[PDB]
Structure 1
Amino acid sequence: MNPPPPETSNPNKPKRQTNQLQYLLRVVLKTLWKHQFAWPFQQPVDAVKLNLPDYYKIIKTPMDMGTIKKRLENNYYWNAQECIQDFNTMFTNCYIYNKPGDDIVLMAEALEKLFLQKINELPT
């Protein structure tokens, strides 16, 4: 019922280590991680544990902060924009699967606004 998690390594993918990417890990991610609403987004959605066989029938591009953290630690990304895309996929997935006002959407909304606050300004 659970698909394979997103990849966190890809040896033929060209990696790069930029100051903006070190800041996504050290500042942006690792503080979202400590938020009280972070825990549902710290690993892939477990459709078996949740008894939600419907999740991966709706969400075809899954993403979680657990995956993003490992991609940052492993220098998976070419630039910060690629990592910011993964965050936005994580948020959008939650808004697509759930409905306005759901508890999980409130958590996503709060994390997103803190996220956007923190990447308004990145190192140069």
Structure 2
Amino acid sequence: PLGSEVSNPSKPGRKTNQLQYMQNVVVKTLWKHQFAWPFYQPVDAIKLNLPDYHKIIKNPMDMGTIKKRLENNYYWSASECMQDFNTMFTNCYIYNKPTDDIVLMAQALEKIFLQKVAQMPQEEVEL
């Protein structure tokens, strides 16, 4: 937006193995889950009509926002993405009731998340 960025030259944003890994491996596969479809759209607040979302939920994020910072090389490595990825899941659990479809989906979505994360390069290699 006009203020907070998704890409910035002065701000470090190198390409490491972990970074490129989670981008194409983790979130892109999370994306391919047919239950991850309600997370295909970022919280624009207006588009999805979520005005009080920005009041209750701390960091209104999803999967399109995470991948946006990833493809724009916002961080240095995927370790920084572990923050936004973590919030996207909790956000759904908090705003939505545990009996909601989106919650039921998020629970299953989380499986492939940790699945690919456990297989992450535990050493890291800057490209």
TM-score, normalised relative to structure 2: 0.82
Paired residue type of 2:89: F
Instruction: Tell me the distance in 2 between the aligned counterparts of 1:88 and 1:27.
Output: 16
Aligned alpha-carbon RMSD (Å): 2.1
Cross-structure match for 1:95: 93
Please state how far the C-alpha of 1:49 moved relative to its aligned partner. Answer: 4.1
Deviation at 1:28, TM superposition (A): 1.0
Q: CA deviation at 1:44?
A: 1.6
Structure 1's 53 and 78: CA in aligned 2 closer, same or farther, altered over 3 A? Answer: same
Write out aligned runs for 1:4-19 (5 A).
Answer: 7-19=5-17
Distance 1:32 1:67 in 2: 13
Which amino acid is 1:91 matched to?
A: F
Task: Tell me which amino acid in the other structure corresponds to 1:81.
Answer: S
Contact kept in structure 2, 1:8 and 1:67, CA below 8 Å? no
Is the CA contact 2:29–2:112 (under 8 Å) kept in the aligned structure 1?
A: no
Query: How many residues are paired up?
Result: 121
Q: Which has the higher helix share?
A: 1
> Is 2:40–2:64's contact at 8 Å kept on the other side of the alignment?
yes
Structure 1 length as normaliser, TM-score? 0.84
Aligned counterpart, 1:119: 117
What percentage of aligned pairs have identical amino acids? 79
Structure 2: tracts of 5 or more residues without a match: none
Distance in 2, Cα, partners of 1:50 & 1:72: 23
Which AA in structure 2 matches 1:37? Answer: F
Q: Counterpart of 1:117 in structure 2: which amino acid?
A: Q
Structure 1 pair 109/7, CA: closer, same or farther in 2 (3 Å)?
farther
**d(CA) in 2 for partners of 1:65, 1:50:** 14
Within-5 A mapping of 1:62-81: 62-81=60-79
Q: Deviations over 1:19-69 (max 9, x none)?
A: 011111121111111111222212222443444432222113111211111
- Which residue identity lines up with residue 42 of structure 1 in the other structure? Y
CA distance in 1, matches of 2:84, 2:50: 23
